[PDB]
Amino acid sequence: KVDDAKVSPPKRAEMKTSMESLIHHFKLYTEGYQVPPGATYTAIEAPKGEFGVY
Amino acid sequence: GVRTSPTGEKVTHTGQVYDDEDYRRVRFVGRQKEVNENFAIDLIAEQPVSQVGSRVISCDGGGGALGHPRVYINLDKETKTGTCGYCGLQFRQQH
Amino acid sequence: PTVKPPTARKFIWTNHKFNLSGTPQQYVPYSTTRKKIQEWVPPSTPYK
Amino acid sequence: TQLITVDEKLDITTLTGVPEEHIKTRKARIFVPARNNMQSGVNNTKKWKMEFDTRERWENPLMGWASTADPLSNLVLTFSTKEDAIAFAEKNGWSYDVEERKVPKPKSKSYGANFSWNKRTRVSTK
Amino acid sequence: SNLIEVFVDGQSVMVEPGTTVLQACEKVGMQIPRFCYHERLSVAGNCRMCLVEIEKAPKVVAACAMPVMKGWNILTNSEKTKKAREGVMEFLLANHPLDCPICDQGGECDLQDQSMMFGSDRSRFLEGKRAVEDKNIGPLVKTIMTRCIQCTRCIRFASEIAGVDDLGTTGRGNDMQVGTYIEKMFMSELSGNIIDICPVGALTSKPYAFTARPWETRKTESIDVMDAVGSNIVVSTRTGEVMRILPRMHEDINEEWISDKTRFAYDGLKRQRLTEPMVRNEKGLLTHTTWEDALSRVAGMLQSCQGNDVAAIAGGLVDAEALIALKDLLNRVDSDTLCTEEVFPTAGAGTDLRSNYLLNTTIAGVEEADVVLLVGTNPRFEAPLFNARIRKSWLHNDLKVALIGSPVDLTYRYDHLGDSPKILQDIASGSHPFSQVLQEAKKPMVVLGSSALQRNDGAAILAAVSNIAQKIRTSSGVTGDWKVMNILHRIASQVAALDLGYKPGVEAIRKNPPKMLFLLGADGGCVTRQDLPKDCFIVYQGHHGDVGAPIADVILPGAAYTEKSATYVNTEGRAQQTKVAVMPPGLAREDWKIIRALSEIAGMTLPYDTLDQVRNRLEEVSPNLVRYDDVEGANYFQQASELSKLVNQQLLADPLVPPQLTIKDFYMTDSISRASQTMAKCVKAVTE
Amino acid sequence: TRPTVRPRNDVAHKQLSAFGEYVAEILPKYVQQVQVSCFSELEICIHPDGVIPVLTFLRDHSNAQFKSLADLTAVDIPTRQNRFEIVYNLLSLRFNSRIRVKTYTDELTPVESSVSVYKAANWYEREIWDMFGVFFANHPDLRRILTDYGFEGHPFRKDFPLSGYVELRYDDEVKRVVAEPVELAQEFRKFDLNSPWEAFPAYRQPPE
Amino acid sequence: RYPSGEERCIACKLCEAVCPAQAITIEAEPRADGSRRTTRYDIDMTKCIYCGFCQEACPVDAIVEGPNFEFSTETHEELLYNKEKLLNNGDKWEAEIAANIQADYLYR
Amino acid sequence: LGLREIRIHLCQRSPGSQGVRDFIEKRYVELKKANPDLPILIRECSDVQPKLWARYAFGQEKNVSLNNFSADQVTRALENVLSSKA
Amino acid sequence: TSVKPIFSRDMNEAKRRVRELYRAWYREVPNTVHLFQLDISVKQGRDKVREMFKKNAHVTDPRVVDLLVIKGKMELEETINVWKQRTHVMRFFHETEAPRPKDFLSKFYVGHDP
Ligand code: SF4
Ligand code: SF4
Ligand code: SF4
Ligand code: SF4
Ligand code: FES
């Protein structure tokens, strides 16, 4: 995972020991991270062709 | 420790039991009501209180990462025993 | 489990039960909460 | 010129597909939402909201769940200004109630006022 | 103009002198994070979260306390500001317990929210945390002092708003504990509001504990009906069940505070309810029946009555819609004998002009007054937020308060003039020094309590206070826009009933006893079956069966204030409207719907079918009942004071005492609170 | 900012800004706004009346050659008087790039269909007619493509609720699948998850 | 359950807040000894998508996704599990769930 | 049968109620000394038109407009209301 | 106030299109009765068509009635070919929904709704 604990949840051993890890685990599995505003279109090569997300 | 209602129905650990005039007992006739006979309150009341020689204690529930988050319990009051918030285990300063 | 038995506990069932669907011993769903609103029972004495 | 002159009010009541029961009996509310007093942030009181009146919610016979029959029970609409919300309200033919925005009154804070000489604003302790 | 120029992130803005950095940043639009700062409490500055950086200066300054000067550029998003915030919150979370899953503050915790916003992402603390011994401060506020961060909002609230001075900090260093140092109960009018202003889960609500979560509760903005203050509240429900009640920010009434009764009457609101219509059987007992049967019996009794044979008593928690529907239904049979349980003196000017039964200045008018005279009232228990406003003006604006009545504890030092009503005669004559004190006052204020009008000489007391107010207003240095004569009410359904032309007091019913009676939740017990004739068809319409329901022939289940959209007028004439949070249980319906259906059955159909048509009828009877959150002035004090002198009512020699003297009598007043278990627990706690 | 922060591409940003200036100065009649996002994407907000003269340009100019139509989208924002935002995504295989063209319309004003530019849009904007109600003028076959045959209303509008106003169930009296007003056994629990604290100061709108 | 008989859940409502199909319904109240315990814990198996968000968002390892997959029923309402059925399933499959958690807990 | 209550809705700022206000300042108290049992409810509003409401027996409510009416006009209207009783 | 028209420059062309759509529906009804094997008469289908046309009789906007004509033509095309089933055609006749209460008294009896 990414080491940004405000986006990816922390390790379960760290959640039961640290305080900031438990707070981030709570706010990530209840509310979720905040995405900056804006619009994007990301396309990959799926086996059926161009698979896009707007 | 499951008590039996006068209608014959069993009472859950929550205390839910259908009344005598409640029609919804038609869901139980010809079948069974699923209740659990291992009550958590009675089983946690059988756990002995642990005597420790410290002012504060740390509880994680046992097993390390397989338990609850670690918390700290103060045992300054001697009249009552400090109880863990998650596991329900109670500790006491022996002084 | 003959060489590595599981850890025994007090609450674990000692008698395994197979799929009981369609049998009289099948699970029946029900609410597990008490009554919310308690109604006002009238008095059992006339006003006279 | 490829343009026409239309002078009548807007009416999209017959195009939205909503039944008339949820048009002539509903009462929308346009308001700036109240700040949660348990917290201190003010970011939830920035945009106007349109909400609908609460209808009947009853208990399920089987599991006790909150059964409902109101399709507009969870419809919250967000608007930047009051005029946009009121135009969206009268466009769809909904009767509305508009609540004014309650901006808090600014105070006059002073740290020295806790240590006055002849006034009653002396702090008992700190 | 004394406005000076400051800069926030390079953006210029005008500020007043004495403005803090936090207020200037808020005026630009930036909300600096804070823990100990409060806009309604004194500046403490003991958390160091608000440390913002001023450019060209080698130190961070506390934005919650630093006064700005000219030429300052404030950097709210620089690097060292964020470094200071991260270090301060790392220190804050170093000793915080891992109690988030078992916390009621989770999901609405300020510490969690700014830890996600401005805090770091991991903890470098590799030591052992502290553990504070818990405390008990009553059955309302649950105390877990392991989670307290020592922000000292407790001390400032209990010292500057509640005026108790019983909370403090004992210790020095990391072992300093915020508590009371003894087994003392923090019982007050506003003892629940600390739960509102605790940024952590240290102080929680004991009835609400372990019940719901803030992210799954729907918030409905409504109006409190528990007293005549008219507090704006938010009802937080969850799937058709009311969970809690929180304050709403209204700068004119209840700024962000509510009394304990308002916060904790909901569990009694969901107890001892009326669900189905009962009628009397052949043995005289109440048995359940359909709506059609009970309505047909009531309409059949009503059809045989005409003139003075049918009357009505209004309750204390009745909306204007139900009141006007019952008034129209009783006017269809030519019956003007409509009464309320609370008594207001009708001798003289009466309920004709709106000047002599309203708090004419405002709730906020105490902020402009300098001398306030309270006559025969106990405002701590009757209107707690009005007493809070008086205390705020006393602490800040140096208000002078004097009291006539019993020497009750009002959490400020007043001048007790005695409990003799004839002392009032001394002010109207001038033999008392307080007459000169009122004469030299630029903005005087005379407040008469509604509990003092319940006595036999209420007309005499009203005449004396009106004489005092007119003597002061026409002889002292009053501008003319100022309103002196004020009356503080205690019933939410009182001003709305008086504006509809009801007759206050049940003496008209006692003068000519009716044959059938209507009770709109009148549970005061002012009228019993012994006063009434032998065969009286008492019809009770309400939600709780307390007093009038055991003596009723037909019980009609109505709706509470959280279950209907209803119009209530507070003590200053400001109309407000509640909203439907949940629906009435069982077969209970809205009150005006019941009255209109009863008129439909009886062949006397009323000309309104929806709520808006009833509101149009309300506007027909009086316009100011449909203008919400709009205070309408009430002039013509001179005419009322001239008409009041005709009836020379004589004051009795008995002293003026209120019905509420201690904290014991506050919790159980009407049917909503008397059917509550939390209020019963509070009474049991304060008695022992 | 090395291992966690996504790397920034500045050459693509400069090239897209230059091409945006190129497009804006070529067509000053229809182009209203040109913007480049932080992750190097170009948006050309244009007038609806230039839906056709812009797109064919990007299809036929020797310096654009946007021969592929990737996605045709519509965004419903009720806070504007022109609540519908039609967005075209174009892919250029020759110059290996992507562009975005945005336009606005309300419920009643029709916009010109681009079936004469890209034929894939023959279905795509038809989908919009099924779910937003934006009528596309001069279309070969415009009808419903995803909803039920007797369905009324446009589901992807924001004022349309999550559950519909009708539901289907089998009735044995009429031996038929019938439509009835909806009655959910359990209500969809609406969650209030917005944090009350400001998150991104870079997007802070100025106050009124 | 904890290895003393006490049930692990403390009614924190993270699982019902993270469940994407809203299959989890939780209602809680303080019980006799003042412990934060559930009163209603319902999982709709016909709503559940079996993705393990609840078993990974649980801070005290209370709810788990056991290895049983042969539990098809003949009636729709039998797939509406209340708290008693889930507790019975936990007591039935604890001897396997504990071993699976002991095997896989180091990857989390 | 007869009168039951009188309702006068007026304004405090607009001049259209001005003469009506003149009535309340000159010919009310003595009028209140002539009808000791007749409830005459005076209601002020911020932006209402002048209005006079008369209630008879059995809910018969009649309406009279009083916009731009002087003291003599509103006095004469009140005498017509009091002496009509229809 | 100048807007872009859809099909009709004023009300006359729009009501002419409404008239033509009504003629097409009236001609089409017996064919949908015959092909779908409905158990109703032709007069019932024609009066249902008249009721559906008179439901939107209060529209005084050329663009709104143009969109209504477009949707009616779409439904007519969907019912000329058998793309609708018997259920989709019969859904205009609410044969399974009981009539709701109408007056105030029955609505007071059966629930809290206005
Ligand atoms: S007060 Fe806040 S940070 Fe502390 S345990 Fe409760 S939710 Fe967590
Ligand atoms: S208990 Fe709460 S409000 Fe009181 S001092 Fe501690 S953190 Fe502040
Ligand atoms: S596994 Fe099932 S119950 Fe658990 S979060 Fe996923 S969908 Fe919900
Ligand atoms: S099962 Fe786990 S995640 Fe769900 S409420 Fe209980 S402790 Fe929280
Ligand atoms: S908010 Fe300024 S130091 Fe606490």
Ligand SMILES: [K+]
């Ligand atoms: K709190």
Ligand SMILES: [Zn+2]
């Ligand atoms: Zn533990």
